[PDB]
Amino acid sequence: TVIDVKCTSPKQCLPPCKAQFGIRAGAKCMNGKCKCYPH
Numbered sequence: 467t468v469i470d471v472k473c474t475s476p477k478q479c480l481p482p483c484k485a486q487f488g489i490r491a492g493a494k495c496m497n498g499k500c501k502c503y504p505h
Contacts, residue, residue: 471500 467487471479479493479500487504494501 467502467504469500469502471502472498473500476500 469479469482469487471482471493473479473495476492476494479495479502483491483493483500483502483504487502489505491505492503494503
C-alpha cells in the first residue's frame with residue numbers, strides 16, 4: 467500500500483503501517499513518501 471505519510475526514513479511510517487495496514491506490517495520510504503507493506 468501507499469499512504470500519504472511523508473518521510474525522511476521508514477521510521478515515521480511504521481506506526482501508521484501497524485495501525486491499519488497489518489499485524490507485522492512494514493514501511494519504507496521512496497520519493498519522500500511511504501510504501502507500506504501490509505503483512
